[PDB]
Design a binder for this molecule. Structure first.
Ligand SMILES: *[C@@H]1O[C@H](CO)[C@@H](O)[C@H](O)[C@H]1NC(C)=O
Ligand SMILES: *[C@@H]1O[C@H](CO)[C@@H](O)[C@H](O)[C@H]1NC(C)=O
Ligand SMILES: *[C@@H]1O[C@H](CO)[C@@H](O)[C@H](O)[C@H]1NC(C)=O
Ligand SMILES: *[C@@H]1O[C@H](CO)[C@@H](O)[C@H](O)[C@H]1NC(C)=O
Ligand SMILES: *[C@@H]1O[C@H](CO)[C@@H](O)[C@H](O)[C@H]1NC(C)=O
Ligand SMILES: *[C@@H]1O[C@H](CO)[C@@H](O)[C@H](O)[C@H]1NC(C)=O
Lengths: 998, 37
């Protein structure tokens, strides 16, 4: 018993197509990675299944070929392969195998032999009438098991034989056969194959192996970034099936049509009509064994499957040999003169002997049959008229005798009679079908009720799937079902016992795979959304669902991978993924008091980045070329639909013009083009990182170059270039920066008025509530902080790609849409093929019209979806562009007092920079720092008069009282110059006695 | 009376005959009789 781990082996090329540096997903028979593979070493029949993976490292070549015959004998066609040193000879011809088929050494294919530490990997498959053989021969290092690595199996040969291949046998050529070959069986699987630039498969991923593999298949990438990914759906399958029809009660009078003790005669056969009853044939089959039971219309079992409105029963007694006359198309006295079945009769003829009951020794002359009639009877007719038969050409004159005989003559039945004249009871059943409601059927069956389990149910003709529980609801007596607000069945009354059973849909929910980056680890956790942990490593139940593979930790961290209602997962470090309640932030209690204030004593100049999309890719679609290509028939058919193509073209043109308007609105704020002076000294402020670099031909700033480096045909689809090139947007950005540096905010509101940069920044400090002396006294420190922040901006942008995640997203979305729009060209949409020329060539025009119509409808719906999605995205981008224009006007051409609009902090000035399809704003902000606690008083009482500060707040260091501005601790002596009286001393609450000088 | 009394099904019969007219039968003795419907 040798069994080995298959590893990642057995991946072949699905088709003849070449692909380069692409990842392709195929649904095809394959060997699942890490699977159950049998290592073999008298020789029973191995099942071929759908396919076989045969891996032989047999250097001795005891294995010469294979026997794929389904019988291994001369009964059927046996596929026989010989792989000698000369050549491979695939033979199919009829061979008389000897008693021991072994050599000392119709349909034939001779080729170069398959054989050459060789790993002979072979894949044998048989689909759509073709037998496919794939081969691979690779050197292996010293090992007695399958090597670790990846090898692709090139196709070797195809055979058009297409016969049934159930069993395969390894051909024996010598008896102890010890051969070291692995055999595995292929399965229908979905795989993802990575082709290199050389055209070969370097690696593969099996979708249904593990959750990480499923998410790799879903994203079509071998590297999965950190996040939570919705992969599949989870449904609980029905374990059992239940059928419930009402109590079989009432029943067809079958016990009366038989066991009647008298069948009258056959000249006037008793006609019995039966309808509206429960059909049960148990008594019919339980009666005496039948001499003749022939059914002409339906099988006896399937009689119960077929429902008949009208059932006709005809009962009579005839002799033994006259039974053969009661059959369709029979000629004979009884058949033509007593009871004639139709040629296309559909019914059962049941006959059983009645000699034991209806035979009398004296002679039972009651039963009679007719032996003289004027003509043959029409089918299904009863003639009871008995007058003197007129055989003679003379008138009978109502009497009998000469040439005038009685029409009827009786059987004389006596028990001593032999078989062939004994009385036989025949009951002919006739079934009629007519176009009206039926309501007559056979024993409707029923199964035991199953509760609290996902079951299929068919309750009184109502079908469904679900979990059946007891219901508190009380139905009215005549009701059967219960239906909720959405018109879905929620309760059912059981027919057999009147019980109200509630129906609950079986558990279903999404499956999400919480993974760190594939670089960080291969461990994953799985979240079943909305599923109780009972219904599905470490199992944890959360409001989102059931989380398997992550351990709950009491401590709280900042959220990393969102899951649900306050639960986030992270890879913190056996130790693995942990789930926790997310921490909103550090708790800080501000020391509030009646007379305590906190005044900052220093500042920080902080530069932040805000990335805003401005424009999206401009696309134009040629409706005729996309839908139809070069086919004239398709164009003629499209003309009937209307002017849809014109509407789509109008919408796309509108989007394109809107994109141009967006870029103009954001960047064309200034009409003049301003140039910075050649002598670039601005009071210690270094704008080199934002100003253009003359050295490189692009004339872009270092930050702009970094942004462009980071972010950075078909079928009627065209990408129209933007009206403004990147160089023109660079010129606009340079003009805005030069105007801001040289003229402050004056260039936005009129003519540019030059002002030294320190003076401009001092006026911005006045704008944020800080005096000029703060800037002029701390000019070098402010300059150094600004320089350090601008330096750090480059590193912050470069190191973290996610900072530019907005703009890139736009690009990706556009590409994705286009790819979908092209991919749906290959979709069939219910037609024969995606290729219009193939449909036109294979099918006649009248039949091809429907296929082309389906393709046109599908492709036109695809175009409409694309245009609507583009319109929604254009609305979003227009909103972003309007926000960017407002920020350019209010943050770059001016100083804004709006909080959090221009950066985080007290806004000083904003610098624009251009990025592919967007704008990056560098906001410079004043952040207070190093705060100190002081005692404060609303007013100072001097000379019985209150005193309030003109600007600032009254503060105390503990013994002395000063007046200082809010945002910077600059204590000043309280003087009448910085105070105003405004009232007496009694009214104000919290007033402090103190001295005010003059 | 002015009120809602929802009528409940009693019998559904698979008769399948077209009905064009109807009539009401009454138990009258050929005794005076007067019934209003
Ligand atoms: C081996 O197979 C080839 C294929 O037809 C055949 O020509 C050759 O005669 C065979 N040789 C032997 C060993 O019989
Ligand atoms: C695959 O492509 C690489 C390209 O660098 C090349 O070096 C290598 O030889 C190729 N392998 C082949 C041709 O088998
Ligand atoms: C059907 O037969 C069962 C047998 O126990 C009985 O309990 C049930 O009440 C019957 N159905 C009806 C509708 O009476
Ligand atoms: C899961 O089932 C248990 C079984 O008692 C129940 O207590 C719990 O409420 C269920 N979970 C949810 C979310 O309803
Ligand atoms: C308070 O400030 C005065 C300056 O007016 C200084 O002389 C004194 O030492 C300071 N002491 C306290 C109470 O902080
Ligand atoms: C301030 O001076 C007035 C002058 O009489 C006095 O009444 C008052 O008590 C003083 N303030 C405080 C807080 O004592």
């Amino acid at each position: 018993q040798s069994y080995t781990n298959s590893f990642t082996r057995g991946v072949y090329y699905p088709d003849k197509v070449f692909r380069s540096s692409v990842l392709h997903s195929t649904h095809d028979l394959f060997l699942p990675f890490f699977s159950n593979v049998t290592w073999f070493h008298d020789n029973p029949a191995l099942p071929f299944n759908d396919g076989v993976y045969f891996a032989s490292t047999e250097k001795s070549n005891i294995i010469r070929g294979w026997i794929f015959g389904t019988t291994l004998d001369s009964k059927t066609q046996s596929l026989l392969i010989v792989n000698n040193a000369t050549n491979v000879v695939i033979k199919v011809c009829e061979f008389q195998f000897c008693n021991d088929p072994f050599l000392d050494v119709t349909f034939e294919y001779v080729s170069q032999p398959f054989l050459m530490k060789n790993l002979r990997e072979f894949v044998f498959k048989n689909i759509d009438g073709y037998f496919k053989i794939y081969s691979k021969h690779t050197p292996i290092n010293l090992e007695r098991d399958l090597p670790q690595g990846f090898s692709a199996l090139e196709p070797l040969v195809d055979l058009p034989i297409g016969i049934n291949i159930t069993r395969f046998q390894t051909l024996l050529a010598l008896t102890a056969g010890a051969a070291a070959y692995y055999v595995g069986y292929l399965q229908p699987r979905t795989f993802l194959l990575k082709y290199n630039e050389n055209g070969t498969i370097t690696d593969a991923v099996d979708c249904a192996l593990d959750p990480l593999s499923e998410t790799k298949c879903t994203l079509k990438s071998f590297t999965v970034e950190k996040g939570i990914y919705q992969t599949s759906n989870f449904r609980v399958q029905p374990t059992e099936s239940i059928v419930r029809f009402p109590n079989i009660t009432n029943l067809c009078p079958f016990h009366e049509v038989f066991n009647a003790t008298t069948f009258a005669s056959v000249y006037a056969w008793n006609r019995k009509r039966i309808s509206n009853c429960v059909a049960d044939y148990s008594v019919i089959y339980n009666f005496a064994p039948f001499f003749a039971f022939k059914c002409y219309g339906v099988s006896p079992t399937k009689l119960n499957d077929l429902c008949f409105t009208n059932v006709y029963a005809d009962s009579f007694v005839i002799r033994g040999n006259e039974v053969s006359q009661i059959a369709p198309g029979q000629t004979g006295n009884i058949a033509d003169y007593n009871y004639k079945l139709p040629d296309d009769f559909t019914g059962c003829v049941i006959a059983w002997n009645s000699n034991k009951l209806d035979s009398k020794p004296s002679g039972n002359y009651n039963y009679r049959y007719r032996l003289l009639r004027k003509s043959k009877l029409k089918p299904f007719e009863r003639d009871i008229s008995t007058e003197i038969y007129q055989a003679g050409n003379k008138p009978c004159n109502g009497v009998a005798g000469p040439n005038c005989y009685s029409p009827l003559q009786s059987y004389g039945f006596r028990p001593t009679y032999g078989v062939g004249h004994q009385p036989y009871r025949v009951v002919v059943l006739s079934f009629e079908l007519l176009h009206a409601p039926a309501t007559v059927c056979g024993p409707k069956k029923s199964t035991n009720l199953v509760k609290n389990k996902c079951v299929n149910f068919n309750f009184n003709g109502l079908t469904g799937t679900g979990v059946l529980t007891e219901s508190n609801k009380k139905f009215l007596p005549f009701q059967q079902f219960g239906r909720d607000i959405a018109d879905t069945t929620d309760a059912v009354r059981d027919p057999q016992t009147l019980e109200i059973l509630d129906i609950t849909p079986c558990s279903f929910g999404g499956v999400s795979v919480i993974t760190p980056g594939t670089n960080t680890s291969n461990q994953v956790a799985v979240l079943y959304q909305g599923v109780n942990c009972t219904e599905v490593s470490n199992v944890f139940q959360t409001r989102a669902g059931c989380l398997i593979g992550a351990e709950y930790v009491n401590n709280s961290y900042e959220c990393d991978i969102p899951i649900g209602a306050g639960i986030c997962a992270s890879y913190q470090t056996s130790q693995s993924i942990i789930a926790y309640t997310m921490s909103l932030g550090a708790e800080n209690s501000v020391a509030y008091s009646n007379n305590s204030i906190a005044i900052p004593t220093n500042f920080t100049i902080s530069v932040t980045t805000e990335i805003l999309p401005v424009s999206m890719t401009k696309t134009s679609v040629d409706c005729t070329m996309y839908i139809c290509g070069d086919s004239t028939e398709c164009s003629n058919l499209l003309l009937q639909y209307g002017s849809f193509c014109t509407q789509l073209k109008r919408a796309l043109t509108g989007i394109a013009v809107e994109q141009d308007k967006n870029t103009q609105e954001v960047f064309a704020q200034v009409k003049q083009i301003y140039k910075t002076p050649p002598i670039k000294y601005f009071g210690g402020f270094n704008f080199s990182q934002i100003l253009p670099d003359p050295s490189k031909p692009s004339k872009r700033s270092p930050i702009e170059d970094l942004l462009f480096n980071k972010v950075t045909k078909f079928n009627g689809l065209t990408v129209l270039p933007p009206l403004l090139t990147d160089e023109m947007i660079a010129q606009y950005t340079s003009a805005l920066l030069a105007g801001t540096i040289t003229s402050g905010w004056t260039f936005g509101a009129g003519p540019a008025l030059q002002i030294p940069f320190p003076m401009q920044m001092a006026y911005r400090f006045n704008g944020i509530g800080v005096t000029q002396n703060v800037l002029y006294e701390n000019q070098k420190l402010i300059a150094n902080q600004f320089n350090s922040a601008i330096g750090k901006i480059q590193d912050s942008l470069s190191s973290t790609p996610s900072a530019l995640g907005k703009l890139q997203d736009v690009v990706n979305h556009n590409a994705q849409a286009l790819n979908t729009l092209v991919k749906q060209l290959s979709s069939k949409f219910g037609a024969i093929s995606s290729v219009l020329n193939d449909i036109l060539s294979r099918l006649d025009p009248p039949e091809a019209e429907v296929q082309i119509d389906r393709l046109i409808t599908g492709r036109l719906q695809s175009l409409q979806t694309y245009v609507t999605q583009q319109l929604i995205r254009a609305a979003e981008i227009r909103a972003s562009a309007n926000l960017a224009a407002t920020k350019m006007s209010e943050c770059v051409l001016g100083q804004s007092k709006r909080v959090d609009f221009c950066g985080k902090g007290y806004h000083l000035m904003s610098f624009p920079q251009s990025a592919p399809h967007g704008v990056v704003f560098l906001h410079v902000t004043y952040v207070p720092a190093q705060e100190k606690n002081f005692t404060t008083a609303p007013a100072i009482c001097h000379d019985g008069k209150a005193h309030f500060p003109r600007e600032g707040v009254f503060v105390s260091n503990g013994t002395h009282w000063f007046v200082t501005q809010r945002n910077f601790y600059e204590p000043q002596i309280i003087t009448t110059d910085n105070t105003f009286v405004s009232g007496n001393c009694d009214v104000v609450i919290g007033i402090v006695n103190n001295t005010v000088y003059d | 009376p002015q009120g809602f009394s929802a009528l409940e099904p009693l019998v559904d019969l698979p008769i399948g005959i077209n009905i064009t007219r109807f009539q009401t039968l009454l138990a009258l003795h050929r005794t005076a009789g007067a019934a209003a419907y």
